[PDB]
Amino acid sequence: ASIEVKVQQLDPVNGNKDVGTVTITESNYGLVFTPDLQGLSEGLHGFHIHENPSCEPKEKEGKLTAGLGAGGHWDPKGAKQHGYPWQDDAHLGDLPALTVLHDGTATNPVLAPRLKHLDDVRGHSIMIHTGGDNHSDHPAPLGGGGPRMACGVIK
Template sequence: MQRNGLIGLGAGLALAMTGLAQADTTVEMNTVSADGVGSSIGTVTAKDSDYGLLLTPDLSGLKAGLHGFHLHTNPSCDTSESDGKVTPGGAAGGHFDPDESGTHQGPYSDEGHLGDLPALTVNEDGNANTPVLAPRLSESDLTGHALMIHEGGDNYADEPKLGGGGSRVACGVIKGS
């Protein structure tokens, strides 16, 4: 009897640990401006799927339309300054590009930045809640980086600069576990 109890306890612990390993990653997103990091606009939840990383936004207060959405290199949403010009969210660095491709090709090409994500759609009420799928990423890629939302859309090309997304308007740091 005692042996069966220990086996059951071991199986229960294994199941519990499996559940912990599969916990979703939730990223708090905040506005960014030349003044620094601002107020929260909601969250983005990331979860592994059979088809890649599913990113589910629960955001409000954004301008309606398409917005560039990327995983950036550094875990910071602070401003940066270069030649006297302040860049909101600039401390996040560029798009995550571990293979150093140096090219912005979007989420479906193996030739570009790994951090290129599908564009976010924001409805007329300023809310974004339509999930997007990043087929080349998994949750394990996120830790130690930042999610960034840009002012404009994304054409997944290098011209205009980085797909034409424009200014950084919201950012969230992905902390390690």
Template sequence: MKSLLTLALLAVSASASAISVELLQAGEAGSGATLGRVEISDSPYGLVFSPQLHGLPPGLHGFHLHQNASCAPQLRDGKPVAALAAGGHYDPAASNRHGAPWGDGHLGDLPPLYVDAAGNASQPVLAPRLKLADLAGRALMLHAGGDNHADQPAALGGGGARIGCGVIP
């Protein structure tokens, strides 16, 4: 009896220390096909984002936690923009600066996501300043192009369009 109770408590504890987010293609007409999942788990060093994604352009991609739990397109200057309803990068301290995941910019700044030549992403990234409690009601965003973790020479790390998005429950 005691061992069953211990196993049940461990299962509840394990599920409370990790979440899974499905990423979908982000487009001007709305969400498209699934790109896979990102498992997010707590560690002594911060949150670990472990992707199992496919069908992506090879190279480094900007990867961020965005303010709103929506991947819907919205209009900007009269034109639809993919996943714009997710808002900007999560920035509860109102730093209004893009920075390194370990620095003092937006709290939603994550390390870039590496996609291999076959279009798959499986390398985990660490977000040392985030906690699981920060994630609820947000969106996980994947951008075209890299991220230099600065606002120079281009705003928001120079990343491109929003190509993948997942709502975090």
């Protein structure tokens, strides 16, 4: 199937920067997210669909905060819990973590088996966090992803 999402590193003060794409296709097992990203920090990063079609910042306690315009994790079924990509009572936007190599690149595709159709993700955003993802709300909320590092709107 295919949606090419342009992703930018978020910096409300100094300016957002292009870091590449995430291409979304359909497989017989769910949606596949194929990154082609550069310039990110080495490690595993939380990777989720967020509810709003926006990567804009929003104030939080008077601080203009990167990516908050995207809202929370996409949760149309009201799971109200962060979890695993293969967990039915987790947010539907919970994707497998994104791998960024030592050289700052990400090319490894990942499968979201609960997302079945491309139209399901249109009108939302894809977020890449500074932290990782332990697929739980303990010991940190939302898998420990923390701040929003990079984002793209899915059209």
